[PDB]
Amino acid sequence: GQGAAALVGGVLLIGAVLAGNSLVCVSVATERALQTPTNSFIVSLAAADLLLALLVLPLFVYSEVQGGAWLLSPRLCDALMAMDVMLCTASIFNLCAISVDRFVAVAVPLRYNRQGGSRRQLLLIGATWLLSAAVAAPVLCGLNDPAVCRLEDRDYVVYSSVCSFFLPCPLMLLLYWATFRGLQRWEVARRADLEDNWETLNDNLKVIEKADNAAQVKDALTKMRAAALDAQKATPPKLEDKSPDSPEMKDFRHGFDILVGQIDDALKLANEGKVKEAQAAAEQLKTTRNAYIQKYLAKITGRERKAMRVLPVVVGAFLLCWTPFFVVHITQALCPACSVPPRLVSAVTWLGYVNSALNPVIYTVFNAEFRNVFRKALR
Ligand SMILES: CNc1cc(OC)c(C(=O)N[C@@H]2CCN(Cc3ccccc3)[C@@H]2C)cc1Cl
Numbered sequence: 462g463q464g465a466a467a468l469v470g471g472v473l474l475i476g477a478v479l480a481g482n483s484l485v486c487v488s489v490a491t492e493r494a495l496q497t498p499t500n501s502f503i504v505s506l507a508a509a510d511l512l513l514a515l516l517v518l519p520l521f522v523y524s525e526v527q528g529g530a531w532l533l534s535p536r537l538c539d540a541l542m543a544m545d546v547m548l549c550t551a552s553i554f555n556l557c558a559i560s561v562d563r564f565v566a567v568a569v570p571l572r573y574n575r576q577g578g579s580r581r582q583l584l585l586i587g588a589t590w591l592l593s594a595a596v597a598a599p600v601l602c603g604l605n606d607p608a609v610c611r612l613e614d615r616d617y618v619v620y621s622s623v624c625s626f627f628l629p630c631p632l633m634l635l636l637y638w639a640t641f642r643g644l645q646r647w648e649v650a651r652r653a654d655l656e657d658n659w660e661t662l663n664d665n666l667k668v669i670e671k672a673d674n675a676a677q678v679k680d681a682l683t684k685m686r687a688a689a690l691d692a693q694k695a696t697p698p699k700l701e702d703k704s705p706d707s708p709e710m711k712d713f714r715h716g717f718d719i720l721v722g723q724i725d726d727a728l729k730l731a732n733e734g735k736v737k738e739a740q741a742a743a744e745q746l747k748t749t750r751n752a753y754i755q756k757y758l759a760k761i762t763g764r765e766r767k768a769m770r771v772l773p774v775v776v777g778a779f780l781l782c783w784t785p786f787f788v789v790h791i792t793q794a795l796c797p798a799c800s801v802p803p804r805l806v807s808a809v810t811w812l813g814y815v816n817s818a819l820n821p822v823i824y825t826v827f828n829a830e831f832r833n834v835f836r837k838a839l840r
């Protein structure tokens with residue numbers, strides 16, 4: 462009765478965690494549009510969820526069929542609980558790492574000399590996992606004084622409730638808040654104008670790629686030049702009060718000067734009838750914007766802020782799913798006499814674990830790139 466619901470519910474939960482989260486990892490692996498700094502953390506979150514389904518949920522379900530009785534070794538129980546605590550902590554610490562990472566990307570504009578990221582996200586992810594293991598490590602040493610698998614050490618439970626949850630949460634919330642406000646300060650008033658300029662650039666690079674002749678190339682380059690110059694005049698509020706002589710204003714203007722200079726050289730070539738050379742100059746121009754310009758066009762048009770919309774939904778769902786769990790557990794640990802109904806302890810646990818099945822759904826619905834890869838699984 463109570464056992465059959467756990468079994469069916471558990472097999473369905475485990476199936477849904479493995480299915481959804483493997484499809485996330487494979488998608489980041491197969492689709493170039495998904496290989497971003499942010500999605501490195503999303504893969505880390507997927508790993509945490511896959512590991513939960515592999516290492517924790519099966520014996521959790523088995524436990525639930527036995528009505529919470531634990532018939533196996535007490536050392537195995539300790540091993541399970543330490544893994545339980547670590548994976549929970551790792552999910553939270555990774556949501557925290559995202560907000561730290563995104564705040565820094567926003568607050569600290571950097572341009573590298575060489576190809577690729579710094580892999581600082583990977584280092585931060587490594588740090589996140591080692592920190593989660595550090596929080597969980599004492600559980601492995603055996604904290605209990607029976608036939609059930611529970612954390613009975615009240616000081617440990619309060620400690621981890623605070624470190625793993627009640628402390629990261631407000632800080633994470635403050636950081637997401639600062640991050641979103643930071644980006645907004647970069648978004649120009651005349652968004653649609655700058656989007657037009659941006660489309661002119663991309664549409665005409667494609668016209669150039671397939672041109673029949675030099676005049677088409679020259680016409681396309683001429684439009685690009687005008688759009689580059691317009692875009693150059695779209696100043697973000699972030700730099701509005703910055704003087705014309707400011708080294709941050711001198712930066713801004715410069716990226717567009719390099720661009721206009723490249724367009725001019727391609728123009729000279731097209732004008733002389735050198736189609737292939739003009740097309741190569743323009744392709745070489747698809748790489749100068751690939752880093753210097755386009756990164757911060759997505760920023761100043763509001764695209765970047767829009768693409769971050771999936772993150773609060775993920776954070777939100779995590780808070781909905783785990784807040785009841787941590788309120789129940791810290792209460793019990795602080796106040797033995799504050800009796801929580803066992804059926805509710807069971808409920809908030811399942812609620813916590815079902816979070817692990819939710820993120821793949823959240824990405825599919827609320828993020829455009831993920832939604833896109835998904836919707837072309839119609840093959
Ligand atoms: C990150 N902080 C914590 C996380 C916990 O579990 C996710 C718990 C917790 O009490 N977990 C219990 C301990 C075992 N776990 C369920 C389970 C897992 C595997 C086999 C049997 C029972 C329960 C949900 C406590 C803390 Cl402080």
Ligand SMILES: CCCCCCCC/C=C/CCCCCCCC(=O)O
Nearest residue numbers: 773774775776777778779781823826
């Ligand atoms: C935005 C702050 C966080 C909000 C709470 C997060 C909970 C996420 C849970 C997932 C279920 C969402 C179901 C909503 C479906 C409608 C979405 C839509 O209309 O585009």
Ligand SMILES: CCCCCCCC/C=C/CCCCCCCC(=O)O
Nearest residue numbers: 634637638641773774776777780781
């Ligand atoms: C418990 C319900 C959900 C609580 C969490 C809500 C979402 C967590 C993130 C909050 C940081 C605020 C970021 C702004 C979100 C909207 C984006 C925007 O309007 O620019």
Ligand SMILES: CCCCCCCC/C=C/CCCCCCCC(=O)O
Nearest residue numbers: 630631780784788791792795796799
């Ligand atoms: C992210 C959402 C944050 C929500 C914070 C509120 C949750 C914390 C409340 C739980 C404390 C329960 C108090 C238990 C009584 C302790 C009294 C005693 O120690 O004797």
Ligand SMILES: CCCCCCCC/C=C/CCCCCCCC(=O)O
Nearest residue numbers: 481484485488821822825831834835
């Ligand atoms: C490639 C996308 C991410 C990896 C796959 C995720 C696996 C779980 C997705 C299935 C959820 C289906 C329910 C809602 C479908 C939303 C599709 C849509 O909005 O058009």
Ligand code: NA
Nearest residue numbers: 509510552817
């Ligand atoms: Na998780």
